[PDB]
Design a binder for this molecule. Structure first.
Ligand SMILES: Nc1nc2c(ncn2[C@@H]2O[C@H](COP(=O)(O)OP(=O)(O)O)[C@@H](O)[C@H]2O)c(=O)[nH]1
Length: 183
């Protein structure tokens, strides 16, 4: 049986680089393809970037209990979420699975699939994070203050997770995750 790992953390912090490394380290890693009801952009392959389904079917799947999690996107313009069946099918086939979602999504997935292992990817310190949120200082004080506030709230609830990986160094963050996914 493949391990299922749900990767989340602070919302203002992109994890695509970490995801990219894991996929390079674990050759047969199945990165969860979210379902969505928005249309494909050119270059997007159905079954690879998303599973593109229409609003009516997405609702069916909600009603049948077939999303581990879902959400309204851009205030309900469309929906996206994680399909249960591919995740379980991959796992039973023995392939390891990584799901990368926001915090509400990971919380929701722990309920619908409790054998999944949730991981909060934490900053090495509050100051490391703060520095990155201020960044180049191209945003307004109001916006930055909101980010810093948002971040402290999110950091304060990392204890809801099965596991904390402190991202001190990319390669050892990635090493800890590899261990959870196959070790
Ligand atoms: N709840 C939930 N949100 C998703 C899922 N997939 C994508 N999203 C959200 O949709 C937003 C925008 O999608 P897009 O611009 O194509 O790139 P993305 O940011 O990687 O998803 C993201 O901020 C995600 O939080 C999912 O499976 N579940």
């Amino acid at each position: 049986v493949g391990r299922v790992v749900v990767l989340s953390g602070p919302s203002a912090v992109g994890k695509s680089t970490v995801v990219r490394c894991l996929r390079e380290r674990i050759p047969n890693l199945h990165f969860s393809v979210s379902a969505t009801t928005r249309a494909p952009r050119p270059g997007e392959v159905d079954g690879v970037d998303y599973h593109f389904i229409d609003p009516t079917r997405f609702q069916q799947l909600i009603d049948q209990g077939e999303l581990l999690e879902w959400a309204e996107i851009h205030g309900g313009l469309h929906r996206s979420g994680t399909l249960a069946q591919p995740v379980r099918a991959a796992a039973a086939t023995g392939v390891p699975v990584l799901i990368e979602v926001d915090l509400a999504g990971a919380r929701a997935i722990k309920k619908t699939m409790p054998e999944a292992v949730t991981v909060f990817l934490a900053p090495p310190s509050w100051q490391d994070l703060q520095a990155r949120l201020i960044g180049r200082g191209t945003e307004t004080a109001d916006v930055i203050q909101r980010r810093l506030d948002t971040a402290r709230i999110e950091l304060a609830a990392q204890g809801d997770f099965d596991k904390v990986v402190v991202n001190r160094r990319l390669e050892s963050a990635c090493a800890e995750l590899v261990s959870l996914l196959v070790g």
